[PDB]
Design a protein around this ligand. Structure first.
Ligand SMILES: CC(C)C[C@H](NP(=O)(O)O[C@@H]1O[C@@H](C)[C@H](O)[C@@H](O)[C@H]1O)C(=O)N[C@@H](Cc1c[nH]c2ccccc12)C(=O)O
Ligand SMILES: [Zn+2]
Length: 651
């Protein structure tokens, strides 16, 4: 019988009323200092790592055997062995990159830049901006074409623009990274520094006209469907008509310009930008995008910046972990099929479905018991909740990889073939009915998700294991673990983004203005509540960026606690390990989040992660949960206590 709670993780010298996070995790945290390759390590990573070890065996077994060309076993074995083949990768050096760089150097003028972007984007690139095919937000049954602002290497545009000393140091390390890899690619000292500085200048200019991370979360702002000619007739600084023609999209009548104001400013930036500076931007981007796929010196330069500088790590993960991760990103469902055959019991799928339906019923009750919302919006909320698509364990049909060509000539060349396959597979959806059954994660992912355009909640097999889902545990702990996860994904249907989408996945208003304003006032109170909290000295939590996840955590806690009480109706509350079932619910929840984390990684996740830090998902989120105050008799002098007027309950 797998224990329901690791009691040894707990630090019972801490009062649960003062620091519940360390009460439930503080001895695990003392006994598990971070290893050099980890920027953060906690319960999710434990389960991730043990799942990865299972996948490691699957992949190593395939790599040891013989397979026919054109099977998935051949594709997996060949990608993985090439990634693992440090002798060949180090022998080849930068040679696999040579022709790609020559193609960029040959771009003769601005017109040729446009055609180059179309050619690389036809391979899956994002030369100056992103583009993708997926459901129309306002017609979720039809696939349309979307364009999005420049993907930035540092992710948050603020890294490029903030004027303080620590931000300048990060920028200088990024430029040193580009200089290092340009030298490794064969440029002399002068050209490598020129390329690094020009690339950073171009990327900083693009970051300036990008939307902020918080602004990218605004649903209505980032949808702008229109006739193509309406935009391309007016904004001709970038020759969209030639670009679209070379992407074979001349007959495309409409598109979704997601960051419309970025593309209006991009019109002038592209028309006026120095050609040599743009070429250097393209060179640095191509080298950086190849740096995980060549010789050790490239991969270590990349680690020096993205690992050591940005995250505080001092070692790379072992090569097999990077290699399994790469294979899983291109052939993940082929691996997922083997994984579930070997490790996923059917009893888990059926027990999980009963659990999800119990949570759905509890959420129906929470919505019925709201009093801040009028009856008419409440009825639309129930309609949405009753139409969740539930996906558990694995997809009912597996992805067909048969057109993916893997040759084994070089790691980088096959990476490009795998990416081309994924790109062609995406473009093939254009103008076709949306496949609503598709999984956006693999069975072996230790995670779960909500998707607004299908109104689906999805629970991969790998997350249905202890400490989330433990078929031997008492109910209280399973509700505190996977039950809160389920309710968290459900609440995403009703957070500041998902509330905009209806039961069919369409971005259609189902709110009265008055109820929406009330939601927005209450949500802003939860945002400001978290932004009062310090994640490090002088650094506030970003309550705005994490607002959707904090709403979902709170919803998961309230829904799952209600479902747990429902399930306990007609039973007497037996203590276990000296804890009431109510206390075991909260301890089981807090045990999901115990982690150690490097100071650098605290700063990085505050800039890029919409999820709060694990410590705040326990110590801050629970301060709004009245049932938690009761379970541990929290008084006004306890450090966990929040004054009632400052508490906020959204749903
Ligand atoms: C309630 C929770 C158990 C499930 C929940 N999944 P959820 O956010 O809905 O699913 C997806 O997660 C990421 C892939 C995306 O960035 C999100 O926008 C969302 O779509 C979550 O917190 N996922 C975390 C889990 C996680 C990943 N790495 C971790 C390291 C430590 C602790 C937790 C984690 C995450 O994706 O961040
Ligand atoms: Zn979430």
């Amino acid at each position: 019988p797998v224990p329901a709670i690791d009691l040894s993780a707990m630090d019972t010298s801490v009062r649960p009323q003062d620091d519940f996070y360390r009460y439930c995790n503080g001895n695990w945290m003392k006994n598990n200092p971070l290893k050099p390759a980890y920027s953060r390590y906690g319960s999710f990573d434990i389960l991730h790592d043990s799942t990865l070890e299972r996948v490691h065996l699957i992949v190593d077994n395939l790599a040891a055997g013989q397979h026919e060309v054109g099977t998935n076993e051949y594709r997996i074995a060949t990608l993985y062995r090439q990634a693992m083949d440090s002798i060949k990768r180090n022998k080849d050096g930068a040679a696999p990159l040579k022709e790609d760089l020559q193609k960029i150097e040959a771009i003769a003028d601005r017109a040729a830049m446009v055609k180059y972007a179309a050619a690389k984007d036809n391979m899956g690139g994002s030369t100056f901006f992103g583009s993708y095919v997926y459901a129309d937000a306002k017609n979720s049954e039809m696939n349309i074409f979307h364009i999005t602002q420049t993907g930035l290497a540092l992710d948050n545009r603020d890294y490029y623009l903030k004027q303080d000393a620590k931000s300048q140091q990060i920028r200088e390390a990024y430029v040193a990274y580009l200089n290092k890899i340009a030298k490794l690619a064969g440029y002399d000292d002068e050209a490598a520094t020129r390329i690094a500085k020009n690339a950073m200048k171009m990327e900083t200019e693009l970051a300036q006209i990008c939307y902020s991370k918080e602004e990218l979360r605004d649903t209505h702002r980032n949808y702008n469907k229109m006739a193509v000619k309406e935009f391309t007739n007016k904004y001709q600084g970038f020759d969209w008509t030639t670009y679209l023609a070379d992407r074979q999209l001349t007959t495309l009548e409409e598109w979704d310009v997601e960051q419309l104001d970025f593309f209006k400013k991009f019109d002038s930036w592209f028309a006026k930008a120095d050609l040599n500076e743009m070429r250097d931007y393209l060179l640095a981007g191509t080298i950086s995008g190849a740096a995980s796929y060549l010789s050790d010196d490239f991969e270590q330069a990349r680690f020096d910046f993205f690992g050591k500088t940005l995250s505080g790590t001092t070692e790379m993960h072992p090569r097999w972990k990077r290699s399994v991760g790469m294979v899983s990103s291109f052939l993940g469902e082929a691996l997922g099929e083997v994984y579930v055959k070997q490790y996923f019991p059917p009893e888990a799928k059926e027990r999980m479905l009963k659990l999800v339906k119990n949570l759905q019923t509890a959420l129906g009750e929470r919505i019925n018991m709201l009093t801040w919302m009028g009856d008419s919006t409440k009825m639309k909320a129930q309609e949405k909740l009753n139409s969740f698509i539930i996906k558990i364990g694995y997809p009912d049909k597996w992805k067909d990889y048969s057109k993916m060509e893997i040759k084994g000539d070089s790691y980088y060349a096959d990476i490009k073939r795998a990416s081309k396959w994924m790109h062609d597979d995406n473009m093939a959806d254009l103008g076709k009915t949306v496949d609503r059954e598709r999984w956006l994660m693999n069975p072996q992912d230790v995670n779960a998700y909500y998707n607004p355009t299908t109104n689906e909640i999805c629970f991969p097999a790998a997350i249905l294991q202890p400490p989330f889902f433990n078929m031997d545990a008492d109910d209280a702990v399973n509700y505190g673990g996977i039950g809160v996860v389920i309710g968290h994904e459900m609440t995403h249907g009703f957070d500041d983004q998902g509330r905009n989408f209806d039961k069919d996945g369409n971005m259609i208003n189902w709110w009265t203005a008055e109820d929406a304003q009330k939601f927005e006032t209450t949500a802003r109170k939860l945002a400001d509540q978290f932004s009062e909290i310090y994640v490090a000295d002088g650094v506030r939590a970003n309550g705005n960026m994490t607002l959707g996840e904090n709403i979902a955590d709170q919803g998961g806690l309230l829904i799952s606690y209600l479902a747990f009480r429902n399930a306990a109706k007609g039973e007497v509350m037996e203590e276990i390990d000296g804890f009431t079932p109510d206390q075991r619910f909260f301890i089981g929840y807090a045990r999901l989040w115990g982690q150690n984390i490097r100071p650098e990684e605290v700063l990085r996740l505050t800039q890029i992660d919409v999820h709060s830090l694990g410590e705040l998902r326990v110590n801050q989120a629970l301060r709004n949960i009245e049932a938690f105050y009761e379970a541990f008799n929290i008084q006004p002098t306890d450090k966990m206590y929040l004054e009632p007027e400052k508490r906020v309950v959204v749903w």
